[PDB]
Design an enzyme around this catalytic site. Structure first.
Site, mmCIF file in Angstrom:
data_model
loop_
_atom_site.group_PDB
_atom_site.id
_atom_site.type_symbol
_atom_site.label_atom_id
_atom_site.label_comp_id
_atom_site.label_asym_id
_atom_site.label_seq_id
_atom_site.Cartn_x
_atom_site.Cartn_y
_atom_site.Cartn_z
ATOM 1 N N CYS A 93 0.688 -1.279 0.000
ATOM 2 C CA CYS A 93 0.000 0.000 0.000
ATOM 3 C C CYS A 93 0.723 1.345 0.000
ATOM 4 O O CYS A 93 0.106 2.379 -0.281
ATOM 5 C CB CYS A 93 -1.117 -0.004 1.039
HETATM 6 C C1 LIG Z 1 -1.522 -2.587 1.907
HETATM 7 O O1 LIG Z 1 -0.303 -2.723 2.040
HETATM 8 C C2 LIG Z 1 -2.477 -3.537 2.642
HETATM 9 C C3 LIG Z 1 -3.840 -2.857 2.967
HETATM 10 C C4 LIG Z 1 -4.778 -3.615 3.660
HETATM 11 C C5 LIG Z 1 -4.682 -5.026 3.747
HETATM 12 C C6 LIG Z 1 -5.562 -5.771 4.583
HETATM 13 C C7 LIG Z 1 -6.534 -5.101 5.338
HETATM 14 O O2 LIG Z 1 -7.263 -5.807 6.266
HETATM 15 C C8 LIG Z 1 -6.651 -3.703 5.271
HETATM 16 C C9 LIG Z 1 -5.769 -2.966 4.427
#
Ligand SMILES: *C(=O)/C=C/c1ccc(O)cc1
Ligand SMILES: *C(=O)/C=C/c1ccc(O)cc1
Lengths: 376, 375
Positions: A150
């Protein structure tokens, strides 16, 4: 002469999933209709996610043909991998073509290619696949990033900035292609970490063209990349973890993630904006990675942002969900679009300076200082 | 002011495997002694590899503990991953510490970190792990590359060059940490090329410090990064492939690889050296990725190189095997060491200009023009 974003193109899978209808879809296709107590917990997560719709590659037909993906933990990486490798390339190509079109120059002028994919490991990678699919110069200088997560929207801009500014005439195509078929799994009563991702994660690809010294007779600047930074949030070890297992990609997030990120934002803002003599965070246009509704609420709260600051960010989370590294570009795209529609003076909501934030594994925070361009 | 390599540090696992004893070891631990014809094919791959020894994390003990790794195709990604993530980190740390020492400046001056690993996908990655293990600035600007392969030695230099030259005072730590626990597997009669991976691939980590505008009162330049390029060899689709499956990382290598690379090297050399007005390929010092002896023999023959031009490259292949992206740095390290020992004027065998080649999946060729520094 700063590296400038001169084109943005986006793509999403054709299957649209309305969040109000997702708890019913998810529990039916994974054959978990008997788990009433766990369904109420997922309804709570989906209604509070602040997401109206998401575009996903997974369909009912895919889960019926591959029952191992419909379960929580089953040996399913091979079948996920096959779809993931093809999906990231196909989505990435569509986004790239749209970015190339806006740019206005022939694709033969692309000198560098940066590809970022949450998952879909292949040797040769998505960068090679996209070079072939888009028929780019075989001598295009490629950078392939698998499994960053992310924060990568900031990472790719950080990379593109140094490439564009150190190579005269360099034109960088960035493709962030995110597909969540790798992490799509059934619910479990013994696990509560991976079910959060089924409600928040969406698919999407975003592509941008970055270059320094724009040819103003054909190229049209959108945002300038002033400075870039990357940092690890203090005392955040193990907070956001992702492991590519035999069951696919598994995400494990601590409940402290929104607090850790938000309490560190003022430090990231100070480190980035003090050399520019800026202290008012409301004077900046905001492009923040919407990891979840809580991160956005807490960033707004602790930083002291007015409701309208994260308006575009929230709208993208609402219309697409969390599309990992690609999300900040959908926000960037929608920001200049809404700015034009509202008759504002710049691409960044009429404001001069801005900030792009990428949040992810580490906890890593990517801070990109942006400068908008004047709009007539 | 060009980006300059100011330090090179290397590391290898403690378990040494002599190639002369490898066919017997490999076939015994993978319970394949009954496959007489396949043993002969593997024995010949090892004997023709021009590798004398390799250092591997994988031991007989690890294979006894994990029979699913010893098998050709058995569900084993999870067990491989656990050892791979820890292994790339500790090997990378050792190489990094040696590089930091040679550099001469405190680790707090490292502004950027580039990590390249054949495998070991983790979120957060080896870059994060190395930042914590080496206690680097939490604000170190990181780049993490997983699954690039054997051309990556050139990729990391290509990246480091632009970072160092665009950021005043930037000091980049590159760590190429290669472990084969991800791809170590038993042989196959149906996929004869898979075992080439166990005949040629060795483990090793290499770390380098790259920076522009050297402070000559503390920093000591080794090689300058003049120009970089990356290209895809024409009509080479599918020649070198690797897929991360439930059984770990697969190995696919077609017999056309040596010819495809060697018939395209002159084009890479021409594209890199014509703007510099250099046409004599023998006037250059050579650091080529030793993907195999056939690539080295054919490159020497078709480019018209003197017999001993790739001496250092062949010596590293002999002493360590193919350590993927880290290999070119072991060659770079040994070249400057041998140049010093042979009383030569420069770090590049007395010569001014040189070339670093990375070969891998695509087929991708990374061409880095280098300039030596006086001894
Ligand atoms: C990004 O690196 C991952 C974002 C994300 C993954 C799993 C979730 O429960 C919430 C956000
Ligand atoms: C260098 O290109 C090595 C490539 C590679 C190593 C190991 C694998 O299993 C697959 C590809």
């Amino acid at each position: 002469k700063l590296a400038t974003v001169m084109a943005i193109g986006t793509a999403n899978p054709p299957n649209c999933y309305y969040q109000a209808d997702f708890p019913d879809f998810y529990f039916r296709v994974t054959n978990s209709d008997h788990l009433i107590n766990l369904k109420q917990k997922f309804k709570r997560l989906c209604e509070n996610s602040r997401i109206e719709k998401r575009y996903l590659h997974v369909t009912e037909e895919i889960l019926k043909e591959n029952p191992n993906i419909a379960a929580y933990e089953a040996t399913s990486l091979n079948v996920r991998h096959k779809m993931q490798v093809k999906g990231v390339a196909e989505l990435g190509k569509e986004a790239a073509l749209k970015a190339i079109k806006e740019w206005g120059q022939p694709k033969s002028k692309i000198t560098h290619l940066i590809v970022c994919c949450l998952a879909g490991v292949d040797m040769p990678g998505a960068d090679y696949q996209l070079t072939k699919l888009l028929d780019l110069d075989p001598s295009v200088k490629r950078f392939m990033f698998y499994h960053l997560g992310c924060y990568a929207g900031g990472t790719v801009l950080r990379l593109a900035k140094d490439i564009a500014e150190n190579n005269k005439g360099a034109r960088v195509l960035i493709v962030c292609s995110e597909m969540t078929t790798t992490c799509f799994r059934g619910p479990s009563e013994t696990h509560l970490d991976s079910m959060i991702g089924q409600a928040i994660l969406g698919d999407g690809a975003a592509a941008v063209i970055v270059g320094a010294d724009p040819d103003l007779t054909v190229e049209r600047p959108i945002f300038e990349l002033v400075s870039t930074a990357q940092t690890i949030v203090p005392e955040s070890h193990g907070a956001i973890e992702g492991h590519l297992l035999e069951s696919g990609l598994s995400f494990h997030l601590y409940k402290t993630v929104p607090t850790l990120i938000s309490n560190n934002i003022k430090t990231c803002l100070s480190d980035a904006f003090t050399p520019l003599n800026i202290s008012d965070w409301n004077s900046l246009f905001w492009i923040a990675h919407p990891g979840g509704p809580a991160i956005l609420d807490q960033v707004t709260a602790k930083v002291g942002l007015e409701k309208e600051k994260l308006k575009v960010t929230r709208q993208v989370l609402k219309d697409y969900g969390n599309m990992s590294s690609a999300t900040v570009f959908f926000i960037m795209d929608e920001m200049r679009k809404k700015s034009l529609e509202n008759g504002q003076a710049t691409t960044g909501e009429g404001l001069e300076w801005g900030v792009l934030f990428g949040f992810g594994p580490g906890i890593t925070v990517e801070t990109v200082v942006l400068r908008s361009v004047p709009v007539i």
